[PDB]
Curated annotation (Swiss-Prot), chain B:
Principal EC category: transferase
Chain coiled-coil ranges: none
UniProt organism field: Thermus aquaticus
Any single biological process term in GO: DNA replication
GO CC annotations, alphabetized: cytoplasm
Protein name per its UniProtKB record: DNA polymerase III subunit alpha
Residues of the full protein shown: 306 to 1220 of 1220
Gene: dnaE
Record keywords: Cytoplasm, DNA replication, DNA-directed DNA polymerase, Nucleotidyltransferase, Transferase
UniProtKB/Swiss-Prot annotation, chain C:
Job description of the protein: DNA polymerase III is a complex, multichain enzyme responsible for most of the replicative synthesis in bacteria. This DNA polymerase also exhibits 3' to 5' exonuclease activity. The alpha chain is the DNA polymerase.
Protein name, entry field: DNA polymerase III subunit alpha
Self-association and partners: DNA polymerase III contains a core (composed of alpha, epsilon and theta chains) that associates with a tau subunit. This core dimerizes to form the PolIII' complex. PolIII' associates with the gamma complex (composed of gamma, delta, delta', psi and chi chains) and with the beta chain to form the complete DNA polymerase III complex.
Residue stretches spanning the membrane: none
Source superkingdom: Bacteria
Gene that produces this protein: dnaE
Entry's family note: Belongs to the DNA polymerase type-C family. DnaE subfamily.
Localization of this protein: Cytoplasm
Organism: Thermus aquaticus
Length: 203, 874, 99, 135, 100
DNA sequence: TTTTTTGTGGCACTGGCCGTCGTTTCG
DNA sequence: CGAAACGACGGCCAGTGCCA
């Protein structure tokens, strides 16, 4: 719940203060509101995996050091594999950071839709925000149709066993178990109700 | 009405005597003719029955209880009882203390069982016949002690229970007649006229020759004797409360006092004479003290003090009274009384019962006899009464052969003369009344029953001489036993828990500034520290943290009651206060204003955060800062932007002890660490009469002597009628009302006011000053050598060692000797030897502690120095 | 407090809505402004004594002067403690998919 | 931080100087450096506290950094740091005193007004006049 | 001496292991003790992390507790009371030699 | 426990200190 | 016609004077 409260601020800060194109935050305020948060390295659009694509291993390490200074043992290496050749580049070197510092890896898929058959349903939803025809071209597209809620068995197809192992899969269930976020509701849930002030001063 | 009284007795006996009166034992009694069912069944019947069944065994407790109920029912007072314990058992249930009982009331086993009385009357020598005389129909007068705070609540209960129109409190000089008329204040000669009787009426009053001196006095004395009988006006009685059956308006006329309490127009004797039920609700302070004793002990160490289940033979409790530590021990605080207990060395409760009873002008002569018999250095003989011995011994062994209590004489009369214990009560009445020749009925009556029992009529008459002698000063055991229990409870809390006992004393009398100052210095000289208040650790009132007494937040002067609570409540929901900034940003000026903040710093409650001079300068700056932080937070925001964390504390040079302790006096009411006087200890040594030791030292000296005394001035007056300024000199041992009358000579001419030390020559009889000297007048005046030798030094060596080492260093310094003897600090100025101010250091080389103290003999005159030149160095 | 504030600072408050008008206390203090005992208005429908449920008091204001009354609450209780609630089709879905 | 509270104005500005462990005024600092040390440690122990700062990168953790070299001050005492003193004046005193501490009182003194007293009462004049009285 | 100890006054006792939850005392224990009054004190041998402490709470006093008290890591002995072994009254030293 | 020459209690009224209401004036 | 600011005030807490 302390983490949930920090997420409530970080989200509120991003809109109220750091809003330009999207609602953005800082590593400075993340440092302030990192209490009770678990961090993952992120998708290809993230800080470390983008620095790796620029052939800049020196900046991604120091950026990993900056996040490792904030979250400590609450930081993790996010390893997600779709069809992308850029993920080969990234995941290979991410593995080295994971093995050097001893951070532990967590597997994910970055799903935007439920099943694989939604691929076109999602793709047309992109064309509605982009306001273009099915064959524009140059329309807001996603690189594939692999962005869905995959089966545990189906994850191994993307992440081979004699290469990754079981640590990405097992950590996924361990972190899910340890995320004990109970919002105050049910037999819980107290009333945050104000007093008012006072007369003068009486009951 | 009589049956429900029996139920409550049978129910009561079970809980008061667990090991003896059990469910099993009650069933048995039913068989010779749920626990509550048995008491119910025993009530039903019936006198004829109970009668047939006709140390303290299980059968004896019943017979006693059964006999008292028989008397109470027959005389027609079961209803009177049921009313009494109702409001007492209500008081217990609603958090109001009830005493063990006063008067004869404690003698009844029924009263004890049910819950009016809370002392075992059959364990001690208490009698029901003393309480209610079975052979005479007279209403018993039950008086009950309560906590002085919660006394009105128990009267308020009665007013709602028995009706507002049927319940109300009862309504209530020669010297004044001469003065009070003249007053409508100075006299000055009018007091010398009324000092002739310090009062008995002028009807009698042999210095009446003053009348015929002046014609003014002729009338005034004749007029004053005519206005004596008036009883002043009307007012409320402390304990008096009446509960009539029918509305009071029908018989007794009423009033309402200034506090709105309903008051009877008749007095006690007039209300009783009409035959109305009267009750005395007394307000005791010991019960109030014992309430705070239980809460602090439970708060400190998690112990539930059950006063009614304490062991009566605790070794630490008695050996504490044996050491004369009766500082706050109930019924035992008097000077001579304290000395009497240390000599006596009490070991059982009966020693305190006898001591308290004997200690008063009259039976006090028997105390020394009691102490030697008690300590085991004088045989207890009854050789004067050999035949009567067997009856006297079991009665008098408890008190070592001394007829102390009234119950003993009743027992001695009942057993030896064969009287009924009811009519042995009547015999006590006759001996007190001293009826000319009526007690000669009791003499011959005693002799007849005496010789039928065995006494040969030579002893019988002389035995009666003994009784009538001790009957004059015979005290009531029931009352003494009950009140002695509260003394023992008081002593018990002190012995085992001395810190919280001292903190209780401070808590009870927290408003009186003189007592607090006394209680602190008693605690400081007992190994128990007494710290100032603290926002982090102190509670509302006095508190015991670990083994240290700690001042409350309420004790701070300018800090509000709401503020005291608000500060405390903020700390609980949040954390402990981390800094000054954290304090005043969490607690706005709204609640804790600047006036209260300043007084909190002066008191020392914010000492954890830093220096007081620095904190006092940092107030307004941080108040602006704290005001600005809210304005930011009251507009979205979050933290880093909303707060530039508290600046460094606004620098300031530290306070000197004079002004620091002066602020402490303003913050709380009295100084923190005793002092200041002893900061310059050169003068403390001189002290010819310490404030405490003044009475002890001055009385054994010539008629109205003179003596020099130092301390600190704490009062401002000047003149005129002249120069008549009343200042108060205060020491670490106390203070005195010093005049400031002789100064109009003129003149001592102080102009010193508060916060400066002085030395004062004064005459004593009250004290009357004559000459005065400030600190620099003392320090400049020619000094003298003073050695402080211990008792340990033999005379037939012969003490030539001290004389040899003083010979080698001649000069011109008087040598003083402080001999700490077995009892009293002696003062000894030397003889011929005058030191030359080199022998100080060369003497400290050996095992002696020398000083360069101011010469006492010099303090006089107004030249040579002089007083002008003694103001120059200051 | 804010209803009495509204009246004094030129903001017309409505006589009440929902079950709020049922309470005499509400009427007396001035939340609602219609005599509940004159008409057949009952307290027990507003607050059921035999059930601890928080009563929801809705108040009608002038549509011009409504933002002022909210502003009063923002200033009074704290800017960080006062905010308005957020509010998030079959035909629309068909057409957009048709495009 | 208990010392940092005792702060009697300019009192602790010298206190931070006197029992030191600094580095010749200390680069980028500050005084005290013993304010940071317990922030690094995080009292009492406490495992999830002294790791924090070492992982980003009481006394041994403080010695583990650190701006040591210099070596200035020691105690806690040490120093640095018509009648009158006199004679002249050093100290050590050359007329009165001391069986010091008294020494220390003559070094903070100079100069050059007499009396006063300040702080305030009240024996520096007396000991002076008494010292002149023995020619 | 031993011969005194074995014949001396026998105060009640309950030995308690360091393993102790907050929701076990002091209501359940004091209730069992209050129901049986007597003239002997009670003690608490707390076998702690380092060293054997003794918290002799208060007059509480009954020989049925043993059965319910061993239903746990705690045991009840009738030892010669540690908090005594001082003073020179009440007993005393003579009346400790008498029953031997 | 009651009487005396005394102290202390407990309550009531005044006064000094921080946020409130009303009128008035200007935008 | 509404807001702002000054001016007069109100309420509470604390001390201090004498009541059983
Ligand atoms: Mg009475
Ligand atoms: Zn992404
Ligand atoms: Zn994503």
């Amino acid at each position: 719940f302390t983490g949930y409260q920090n997420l409530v601020r970080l989200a509120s800060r991003a809109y109220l203060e750091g809003f330009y194109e999207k609602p953005r935050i800082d590593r400075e305020i993340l440092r302030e509101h990192a209490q009770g948060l678990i961090a993952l390295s992120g998708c290809l659009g993230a800080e470390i995996p983008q620095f790796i694509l620029q052939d800049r291993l020196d900046l991604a390490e120091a950026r990993l050091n900056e996040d490792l200074s904030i979250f400590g043992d609450r930081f993790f290496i996010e390893i997600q594999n779709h069809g992308l050749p850029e993920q080969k580049k990234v995941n290979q070197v991410l593995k080295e950071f994971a093995r050097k510092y001893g951070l532990g890896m967590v597997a994910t898929n970055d799903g935007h839709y439920v099943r694989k058959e939604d691929a076109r349903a999602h793709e047309v939803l992109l064309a509605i925000q982009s306001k273009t025809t099915l064959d524009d071209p140059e329309r807001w597209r996603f690189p594939c149709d692999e962005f869905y809620v995959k089966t545990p068995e189906e994850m191994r197809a993307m992440l081979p066993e004699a290469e990754w192992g079981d640590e990405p899969f097992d950590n996924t269930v361990e972190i899910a178990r340890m995320c004990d976020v109970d919002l105050p509701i049910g037999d819980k849930m107290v009333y945050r109700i104000p007093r008012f002030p006072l007369p003068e001063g009486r009951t | 009405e009589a049956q429900y009284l029996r139920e409550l007795t049978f129910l009561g006996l079970l809980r008061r005597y667990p090991d003896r009166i059990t469910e099993a034992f009650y069933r048995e009694v039913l068989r010779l003719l749920d626990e509550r069912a048995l008491a119910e069944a025993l009530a039903r019947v019936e006198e004829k029955a109970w009668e047939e069944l006709r140390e303290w065994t299980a059968e004896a407790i019943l017979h006693r209880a059964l006999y008292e109920l028989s008397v109470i029912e027959r005389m027609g007072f079961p209803g009177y009882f049921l009313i009494v314990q109702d409001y007492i058992n209500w008081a217990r249930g609603h958090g109001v203390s009830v005493g063990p009982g006063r008067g004869s009331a404690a003698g009844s086993l029924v009263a004890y069982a049910v819950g009016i009385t809370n002392i075992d009357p059959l364990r001690f020598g208490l009698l029901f016949e003393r309480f209610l005389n079975p052979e005479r129909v007279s209403m018993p007068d039950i008086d009950t002690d309560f906590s002085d705070r919660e006394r009105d609540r128990v009267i308020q209960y009665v007013r709602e229970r028995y009706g507002e129109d049927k319940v109300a409190q009862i309504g209530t000089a020669s010297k004044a007649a001469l003065k009070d008329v003249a007053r409508v204040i100075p006299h000055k000669k009018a007091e010398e006229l009324a000092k002739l009787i310090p009062p008995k009426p002028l009807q009698e009053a042999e210095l009446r020759a003053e009348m015929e001196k002046d014609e003014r006095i002729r009338q005034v004395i004749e007029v004053a004797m005519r206005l004596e009988g008036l009883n002043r006006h009307a007012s409320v009685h402390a304990a008096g409360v009446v509960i009539a059956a029918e509305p009071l308006t029908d018989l007794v006329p009423l009033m309402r006092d200034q506090e709105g309490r309903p008051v009877t127009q008749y007095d006690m004797g007039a209300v009783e004479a009409l035959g109305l039920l009267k009750m005395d609700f007394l307000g005791l302070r010991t019960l109030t003290f014992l309430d705070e004793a239980r809460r602090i002990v439970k708060e400190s160490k998690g112990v539930e003090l059950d006063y009614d289940r304490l062991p009566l033979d605790d070794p630490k409790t008695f050996e504490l009274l044996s050491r004369g530590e009766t500082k706050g021990v109930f019924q035992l605080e008097s000077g001579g009384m304290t000395a009497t207990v240390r000599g006596l060395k009490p070991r059982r409760l009966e020693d305190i019962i006898a001591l308290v009873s004997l200690y008063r002008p009259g039976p006090m002569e028997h105390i020394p006899t009691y102490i030697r018999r008690h300590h085991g250095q004088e045989p207890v003989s009854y050789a004067e009464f050999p035949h009567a011995e067997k009856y006297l011994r079991p009665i008098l062994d408890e008190t070592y052969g001394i007829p102390v209590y009234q119950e003993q004489i009743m027992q001695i009369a009942s057993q030896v003369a064969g009287y009924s214990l009811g009519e042995a009560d009547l015999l006590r009445r006759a001996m007190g009344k001293k009826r000319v020749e009526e007690m000669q009925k009791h003499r011959e009556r005693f002799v007849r029953g005496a010789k039928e029992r065995g006494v040969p009529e030579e002893e019988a008459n002389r035995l009666f001489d003994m009784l009538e002698a001790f009957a004059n000063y015979g005290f009531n055991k029931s009352h003494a036993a009950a009140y002695s229990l509260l003394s023992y409870q008081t002593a018990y809390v002190k012995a085992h828990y001395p810190v919280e006992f001292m903190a209780a004393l401070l808590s009870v009398e927290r408003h009186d500034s003189d007592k607090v100052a006394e209680y602190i210095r008693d605690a400081r000289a007992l190994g128990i520290p007494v710290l100032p208040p603290d926002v982090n650790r102190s509670g509302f009132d006095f508190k015991v943290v670990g083994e240290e007494i700690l001042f409350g937040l309420s004790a701070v002067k300018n800090v509000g009651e709401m503020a005291a609570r608000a500060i405390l409540e903020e700390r609980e929901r949040g954390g402990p206060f981390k800094s000054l900034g954290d304090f005043l940003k969490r607690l706005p000026e709204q609640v804790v204003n600047k006036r209260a903040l300043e007084s909190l710093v002066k008191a020392g409650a914010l000492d954890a955060f830093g220096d007081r001079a620095r904190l006092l300068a940092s107030l307004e700056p941080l108040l602006r800062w704290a005001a600005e932080t809210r304005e930011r937070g009251r507009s979205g925001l979050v933290g880093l932007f909303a707060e530039v964390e508290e600046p460094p504390l606004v620098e300031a040079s530290p306070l000197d002890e004079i002004t620091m302790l002066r602020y402490e006096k303003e913050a709380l009411g009295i100084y923190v660490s005793g002092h200041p006087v002893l900061r310059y200890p050169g003068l403390r040594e001189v002290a010819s009469c310490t404030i405490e030791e003044l009475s002890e030292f001055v009385r054994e000296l010539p008629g109205k002597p003179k003596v020099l005394l130092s301390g600190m001035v704490e009062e401002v007056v000047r003149k005129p009628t002249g120069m008549m300024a009343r200042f108060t000199l205060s020491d670490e041992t106390g203070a005195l009302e010093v005049v400031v009358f002789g100064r109009a000579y003129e003149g001592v001419s102080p102009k010193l006011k508060e916060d400066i030390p002085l030395l004062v020559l004064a005459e004593v009889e009250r004290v009357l000053a004559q000459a005065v000297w400030t600190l620099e007048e003392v320090l400049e005046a020619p000094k003298a050598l003073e050695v402080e030798v211990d008792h340990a030094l033999l005379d037939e060596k012969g003490v030539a060692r001290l004389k040899s080492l003083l010979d080698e260093h001649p000069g011109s310094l008087p040598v003083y000797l402080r001999v700490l003897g077995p009892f009293g600090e002696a003062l000894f100025a030397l003889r011929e030897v005058r030191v030359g101010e080199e022998a100080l250091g060369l003497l400290e080389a050996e095992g002696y502690r020398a000083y360069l103290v101011p010469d006492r003999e010099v303090f006089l005159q107004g030249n040579g120095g002089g007083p002008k030149e003694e103001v120059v160095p200051f | 407090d804010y209803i009495n504030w509204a009246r004094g600072h030129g903001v017309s408050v409505g006589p009440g809505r929902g079950s709020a008008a049922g309470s005499l206390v509400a009427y007396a203090v001035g939340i609602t402004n219609i005599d509940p005992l004159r008409f057949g208005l009952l307290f027990e429908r507003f607050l059921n004594p035999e059930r601890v449920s928080m009563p929801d008091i809705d108040t009608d204001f002038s549509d011009r002067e409504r933002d002022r009354v909210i502003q009063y609450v923002r200033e009074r209780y704290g800017e960080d403690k006062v905010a308005q609630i957020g509010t998030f089709a079959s035909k629309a879905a068909l057409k957009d998919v048709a495009r | 931080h208990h010392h940092h509270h005792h702060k009697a104005g300019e009192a602790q500005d010298l206190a931070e100087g006197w029992r030191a462990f600094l580095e010749a005024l200390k680069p980028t600092l500050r005084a005290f450096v013993r304010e940071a040390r317990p922030h690094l440690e995080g009292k009492t122990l406490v495992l999830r506290f002294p790791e924090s700062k070492a992982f980003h990168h009481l006394l041994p953790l403080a010695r583990a950094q650190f701006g040591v070299e210099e070596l200035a001050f020691v105690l806690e005492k040490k120093s640095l740091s018509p009648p009158w003193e006199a004679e002249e004046g050093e100290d050590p005193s050359e007329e009165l005193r001391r069986l010091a501490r008294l020494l220390g009182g003559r070094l903070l003194w100079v100069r050059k007004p007499k009396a006063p007293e300040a702080e305030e009462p009240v024996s520096e004049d007396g000991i002076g006049g008494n010292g002149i009285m023995p020619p």
